[PDB]
Structures are given as C-alpha cells and as structure tokens.
Amino acid sequence: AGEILIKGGKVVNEDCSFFSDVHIRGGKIVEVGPDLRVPPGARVIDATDRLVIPGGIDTHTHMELAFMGTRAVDDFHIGTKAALAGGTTMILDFVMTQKGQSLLEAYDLWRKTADPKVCCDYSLHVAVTWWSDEVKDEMRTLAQERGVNSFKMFMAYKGLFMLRDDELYAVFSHCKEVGAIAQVHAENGDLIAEGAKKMLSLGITGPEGHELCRPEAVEAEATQRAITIASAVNCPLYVVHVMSKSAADVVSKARKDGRVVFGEPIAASLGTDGTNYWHKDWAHAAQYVMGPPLRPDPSTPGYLMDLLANDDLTLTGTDNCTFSRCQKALGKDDFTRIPNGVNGVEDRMSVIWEKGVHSGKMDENRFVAVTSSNAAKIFNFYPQKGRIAKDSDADVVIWDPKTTRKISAQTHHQAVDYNIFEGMECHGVPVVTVSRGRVVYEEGRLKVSPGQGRFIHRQPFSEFVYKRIRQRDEVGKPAVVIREPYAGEVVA
C-alpha cells in the first residue's frame, strides 16, 4: 500500500511545534493528529523523543557539473543519496548553459541526466549566461511550460558568464514579466579578473591568492549593485551563496528598506571559514576553494547564522559541487585552475542545527523555515513541501536533536574523499528519512534506487515573492506634474 504511521513524535513546522502522529499514504501526508489508529499492514515508525520535521530542501546544488571535461564527483545518484542520509529530501540544481547555447537544450540535457538518477525529488534553476531575442523566448517557455521560475545571472566570470549592467537590467525586467525570480552570483567580475592576474604576477599561486584576489568588498559591491538594478525595474531578487558579513549586511539593509530581495548563505559559509586557505598543506587549503571564497574573518559564520536567525538572510543551500583531491590538484601550480566547489549536501541539516539551534541563535521552528519552508515558498511549492500537514508531500525526517554525530569523510555518503566540516561534532541527527512516502534511510542505511525521485514542475508568480511586486506596479507608478506649456523664449 505504502502506508506509514510516524507515532510518538513532536511535529515542528515553521510556525509552531506540537505532539501528533503523522499518517502517510500514497506519497502524501493524509492525517496529522494525536493517537492515530494503525491501519492493518501500515508500518509504524516510532518517533518518541524525536522531532518530526519537513525534509530539508537544498536550494543550491551542482551534481556532476563538468570542469574542463572532468565532472564533479557527487553525481545526481550519489549526491541525492548523500542528501537523504543527511536529512535533505529535495535538491534544486542549476542548468549551466554555455554562452550562445540554447537554454532549452541545456534544460533537456539536465532532465535526461537527472531523471533516471535522482533518489529524492528535485527541480532546476536555469542560468542565463548570455542575452538575445532567442534567450528571451526560451526563458518565457521555461517559465510557462518547463516548470522553472528561477533564472541565475552572473556578475562574476568575465568573458565566460558575466553580464554587464545594461544586460542585467533587460534580463531582470524579463524575469519580472514572466514571473520568475532573478538569482545572482554577486561579485564584481572586472575586479576578480584583475585581482587574479595581480596575485599570479606576484607569485601567490596557492589557495590564499584565490581569496586575496577578491576580498569581501568585491562581493558586497556587486550585491548592492544587483539590488539597485532589480529595485529599479521592480524585479524580485535572490542573492545566491552569501559568503561574507559585508554582503550579508547589504542584503539586510536593503530588506529593511523594503527591497524585495532574499539572501541565501550556504552550509559552508555557516559552518567553516576561509582561514583554511592559509593552511600549510596545499591539498587541505584547496579543498575549501569555491566562488565566492570563504572569508578569513573567523567571526563570519557566527554572524551569518545571527542574520539567518533574524531573517536578514532567509534560507540555505550548499552549493555542493564536489571535486576529489586528485581533481583539485589540477591547480596545484595556479589557483585559477583549481576546480571550484565544496561539499555540504549531506551535512547541511546537522551543521545548521548545531551552529544555529544548539547554540541558542534560533529555535527549532526557524530551523524548519530556513532549511525547507522558505525554499518551498520562494520557488513555489508550499505547503506541498516544507510543512507537516494533511495533503502535503510525505518528505519527512525523524530528527534526534539531543544526540551528536561527528562529521567525517570516513563515514559520510558523499563521493568526495574529504569533508570541509571534518571533525565537527553536531547535535542533531537525522535518524529516519522518508521521501515520497517511502522509508529511504534508517539505522544508518540507505534504501532507495536511482530514478525513484521526481522532477518538481513549478508555476511562475510565486505569491510569496510577487504579492508586493504586483501591488507596487499598481500604486508606485511615476506621475507627471500637470503644467501649462512653457510660453517664453528659447535660445537659437
């Protein structure tokens, strides 16, 4: 039948927590209430002394993304298994279209790669790495027909993905017309390009040059710039992988000023820092290289977690894009050749619980909001996911917040052979993971097959995102002053 009763636990949604059992049938939660009856044949999962939470939604992944022909080692199959083992039940991955290439072709290639491999549900964001009439039409098709309401634009990567301010204005205006949210990689690509050339010329070829060539002012600048453009066109904006206190403070100030913008720190920037780039062991230092870089101010992850607790920042992903030690070593002599990307998909939930809830910065309900609910609201499938409620999808984690686990590359399920959180002791253990109403992870073992997950098709004009946008189109139009024509003389 696929019938499950989760009994004895405490349900934790983003608004409040309460003791209740949860009845799962046919992929769905069909009842939430105290002391529910066990129908003959249903499996009982005993959640006594545990929390029963919506499974995590990782807003930010890059499973098996190609770097110069060699692919990230966590692929859609191993990467989603690792997600489940860490309490995350959905991933949103970026379709990376090359400059001049069809976005629809790249979307089809992502679906054909991911559909037969994912072990949990997923969806896609689509990168807009160039601009033309064709891109414009393909974005409308993606939004209206292909289930994608999120487009990602780059202010970094000069010559490769970067768009200039005039093209960002056009692309953002078009996001707004099709009801999508505009995501941005906010670092100044002209400064990165110059900074890297400068560090190499000085013989700083190691990972410390990767951070030194683009310190946090470069990320803060472009973040304010994207906000200013999106505000000029009334387009909702999403700043992916916020890595620094000063970029987080730009998003914080803009939201207090009423800008429709959301900021997304990732597990890496919440759980570790960039002092690792200065480690004497080259291999250790290269493990942390990603764009934008982790920051060498050690107060950074605690401050980003304070701003996530306070809703200056709103939700979390991992930017999981993993490369083995032998793949990182492509840039042993030149940091610009190190394939960028770190791990996180598996450890996100425990890292945030340990650094955010156990530390007393946020409570269990805000934890659910920043790890599933807000993702579901922004990308338009709430309360289908991100809530324990009748009629929601049965993507459910039984969570032990009292026991600790030590995070280690020796025990993790990711394909990558190191872990940037190596050694960390976290309160908060996913003990059972249910995905699409099936037990896919329990007693430390995965039970799931490649292709069991499904692509989630979303509609455009997410209400959480657009209700203010649409009201501002109605009352915020600029008005002419009514005047008599100017009568006087004009110079020759």
Ligand X SMILES: NC(=O)CN(CC(=O)O)CC(=O)O
- What does the binding site for ligand X look like in residue numbers (CB under 6 A)? 62, 65, 67, 96, 192-193, 196, 210, 213-214, 241, 289-291, 319, 321, 335-336, 338-342
Give whole-number Cα distances, 73 to 119, 268, 413, 419, in Å: 16, 18, 12, 13
Q: How far is the CB of 209 from ligand X (least distance, A)?
A: 7
C-beta closer to ligand X: residue 21 or 93: 93
C-beta closer to ligand X: residue 48 or 201: 201
Closest CA to 374 of 315, 433, 438, 455: 315
Give the tokens for residue 264: 């997304």
Q: How far is the CB of 352 from ligand X (least distance, A)?
A: 18
C-beta closer to ligand X: residue 14 or 319: 319
Give the tokens for residue 6: 């989760």
C-beta closer to ligand X: residue 28 or 158: 158
Residue 336: alpha-carbon gap to chain centroid: 24
Q: How far is the CB of 14 from ligand X (least distance, A)?
A: 27
Q: How far is the CB of 109 from ligand X (least distance, A)?
A: 15
Three-state DSSP at 73 gives coil
C-beta closer to ligand X: residue 24 or 182: 182
Q: How far apart are CA 468 and CA 218, in angstroms?
A: 30
Quick count: other Cβ atoms within 10 Å of Cβ 141? 14
Closest CA to 125 of 315, 378, 339, 341: 378
Q: Angle at which helices 300-309 and 245-256 pack, to 10 degrees? A: 20
C-beta closer to ligand X: residue 210 or 412: 210
Q: How far is the CB of 154 from ligand X (least distance, A)?
A: 8
Query: Where in 128-168 does DSSP place strands (E)?
Result: 150-154
Closest CA to 309 of 235, 361, 236, 251: 361
Q: How far apart are CA 243 and CA 344, in angstroms?
A: 14
Indicate the Cα dihedral angle 279, 218, 420, 98, nearest 10°: -120
C-beta closer to ligand X: residue 236 or 274: 274
Q: How far is the CB of 338 from ligand X (least distance, A)?
A: 5
C-beta closer to ligand X: residue 119 or 213: 213
Q: How far is the CB of 66 from ligand X (least distance, A)?
A: 8
C-beta closer to ligand X: residue 202 or 481: 202
C-beta closer to ligand X: residue 45 or 338: 338
Name residue 181's beta-bridge partners.
150
Closest CA to 28 of 12, 46, 4, 55: 4
Quick count: other Cβ atoms within 10 Å of Cβ 391? 11
Q: How far is the CB of 94 from ligand X (least distance, A)?
A: 6
Q: How far is the CB of 415 from ligand X (least distance, A)?
A: 16
Query: Where in 55-117 does DSSP place strands (E)?
Result: 56-61, 66-67, 70-71, 88-95
Three-state DSSP at 152 gives strand
Q: How far is the CB of 393 from ligand X (least distance, A)?
A: 27
What phi and psi values does residue 267 have, to the nearest 5 degrees?
-55, -45
